[PDB]
Ligand binder design. Sequence first.
Ligand SMILES: N[C@@H](CCC(=O)N[C@@H](CS[C@H]1c2ccccc2-c2ccccc2[C@@H]1O)C(=O)NCC(=O)O)C(=O)O
Ligand SMILES: N[C@@H](CCC(=O)N[C@@H](CS[C@H]1c2ccccc2-c2ccccc2[C@@H]1O)C(=O)NCC(=O)O)C(=O)O
Lengths: 217, 217
Amino acid sequence: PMILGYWNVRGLTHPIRLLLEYTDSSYEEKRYAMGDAPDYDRSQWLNEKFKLGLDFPNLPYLIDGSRKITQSNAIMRYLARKHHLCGETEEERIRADIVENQVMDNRMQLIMLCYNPDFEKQKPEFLKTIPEKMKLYSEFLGKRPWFAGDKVTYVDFLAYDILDQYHIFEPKCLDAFPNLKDFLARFEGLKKISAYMKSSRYLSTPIFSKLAQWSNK
Amino acid sequence: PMILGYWNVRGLTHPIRLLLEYTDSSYEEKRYAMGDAPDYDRSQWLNEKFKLGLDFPNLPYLIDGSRKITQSNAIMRYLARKHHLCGETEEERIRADIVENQVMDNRMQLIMLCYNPDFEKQKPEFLKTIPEKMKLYSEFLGKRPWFAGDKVTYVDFLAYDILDQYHIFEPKCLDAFPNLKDFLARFEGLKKISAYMKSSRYLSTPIFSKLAQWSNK
Ligand SMILES: N[C@@H](CCC(=O)N[C@@H](CS[C@H]1c2ccccc2-c2ccccc2[C@@H]1O)C(=O)NCC(=O)O)C(=O)O
Ligand SMILES: N[C@@H](CCC(=O)N[C@@H](CS[C@H]1c2ccccc2-c2ccccc2[C@@H]1O)C(=O)NCC(=O)O)C(=O)O
């Protein structure tokens, strides 16, 4: 089968796991464990990082026969193309391209805060900026059932993850935006998704590694 | 014409400015200036940030007729589709996907170092990791004239910019990798590119804002 490698956390891999499941892909995972503080041992991965034939070794990685991929968005795009989950028009492509990138920025902002030793004092300033982020997603989606338009695309997998993550962080953050709450429900309502969420493989939390100040255990 | 919005520095926008020239695009740029310390006034952008009708306001932005794009990578892909500078086979698409994302990683690394108050302390250690970074681009490229294959694609402009920036930071970094030096020369050799580099519109430095510890003026 295909092989997915990543840490034994949700991290930035959720969308891939979700996409593999929604597609009925035959895959096996390799979930690498990181030790606890203070050394945070990474040996399980480091022992093989340069032994898998990857061009730019990293986690996550996807091995599909002869094809070896790294960079989470590249993996998302490989599986999208294989299953026709890319935009079909120029308008759908542009919306997908922007959301892919926007998701990574809002993911980077969360990471920055959750790895900061000054987390508890930084937190208040971060919470103030949430409503603006959610507003932009809300206005972007509008009345469409999905981010790219009329049909589910690989970018709905990205968007679901980051909205979900922010919602775990600040549970009241979507109260003001009904179309976002509805989007989450719709996504989770997808049969393959609904199924997966009750499976032994589902890994919602922790989000971050042991080094983080939040969702780290 | 098209409008490219960004700060009056090279930043992360060199690939876009270079692709606009390579494609003989009809464009004008709005180069916003940031005030000096202590406040580093951003008002020139901030007064119009939410009045341009951008979905997710940011810099750079591209206005092309009725289309308004943000996210540098989304601007690059939009131009590539526009001008047929994408990969044409699955193989080339995967190569492009990986590079695009790899370049961003390598950029974020340089950025993180450059905006660290402790830059001088940190530099020496950073320099030791360059060779390994350069070696992966070297082996990836191999004997190919361009990163995705036989034809120039948008990812070449991305690759050019990050190898150029690493070379400014450490002038000896490419000596061990002739294929990378040859690539820089081949890229710079593209006719429209040569002409641009001698023009009044070229902006190779500074790379960063005044907030940075290197290439900040
Ligand atoms: N742009 C690339 C970035 C690839 C990348 O940086 N990989 C990290 C793992 S991903 C990151 C992360 C991002 C968000 C939330 C959590 C995590 C995380 C969780 C547990 C442990 C390490 C992490 C990390 O903080 C990794 O550990 N790499 C192997 C190595 O360096 O040898 C991508 O999109 O795919
Ligand atoms: N993922 C996105 C990110 C877009 C984004 O972060 N934009 C920054 C400018 S770009 C960044 C930069 C990155 C690399 C090198 C230099 C810079 C830089 C230079 C001058 C002044 C500000 C910067 C920055 O540190 C900005 O100022 N945004 C408008 C605002 O927030 O209101 C992209 O790829 O497009």
